Paper text:
HP0935 is a small (161 amino acids long) single GNAT domain-containing protein belonging to type IV protein acetyltransferases. A biochemical study showed that HP0935, the only known protein acetyltransferase in H. pylori, can acetylate free lysine amino acid and lysine residues in proteins. The crystal structure of HP0935 revealed a conserved GNAT fold, characteristic of the GNAT superfamily. The structure of HP0935 is composed of seven β-strands and four α-helices arranged in a topology—β1· α1· α2· β2· β3· β4· α3· β5· α4· β6· β7.
To gain structural insights, the crystal structures of HP0935 in its apo and ACO-bound forms were determined to be 2.00 Å and 2.40 Å resolution, respectively (see Experimental procedures). The apo- and ACO-bound HP0935 crystallized in distinct space groups, C2 and P61, respectively. A key observation was the partial disorder in the α1-α2 and complete disorder in the β6-β7 loop region in the apo-HP0935 structure, as evident from missing electron density. In apo-HP0935, the α1-α2 loop adopts an extended, distal conformation, positioned away from the ACO-binding cleft. In the distal conformation, two to three residues at the C-terminus of the loop are disordered, probably, due to the lack of stabilizing contacts. In apo-HP0935, this region remains disordered, exposed to solvent channels, whereas in ACO-HP0935, it is ordered as a β-hairpin and forms part of a β-sheet alongside β1, β2, and β3 from a symmetry-related molecule. Structural analysis of HP0935 identified E77 and H115 as potential general base residues and Y127 as a general acid. A conserved water molecule, hydrogen-bonded to L78, H115, and E77, was observed.
Numbering used by the authors: 0 to 34, 37 to 142, 148 to 161
Amino acid sequence: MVTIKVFSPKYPTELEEFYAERIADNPLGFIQRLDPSISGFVQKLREHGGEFFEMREGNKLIGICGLNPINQTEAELCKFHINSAYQSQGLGQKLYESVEKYAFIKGYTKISLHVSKSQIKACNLYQKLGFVHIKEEDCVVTLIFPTLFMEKILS
Ligand SMILES: [K+]
Ligand SMILES: [K+]
């Protein structure tokens, strides 16, 4: 039974551990800009009016997804991460579709996101989910993070 809900920890550090496992899952050897802890992020997101979701297989946390309000009608998808062993079942898509229905019910008509240009598999999923390419920027930080900005209108 795959279940999607608002994230609720089984134990206080469950999210930290899940997130560290996702960051550790880097087989192509991409450079990583590490991120408060994810639990702090979630707390702040909820205080700002956002929401943070789990997907579980039985009791096992297998995915997460955040929604962060930009304004009255646009939300930003954030911290979207699936355990890569569940990528061929289309469970990333299942979690996103639940999150999207939630967004829609909440009065959002646009979801925006940004993603590293190196992350092919992620970009390909977002395309599959109906995100459209708006712009690329090499974000200077000197480290350059080539970044893809995408949106989806909801109906
Ligand atoms: K890289
Ligand atoms: K819903």
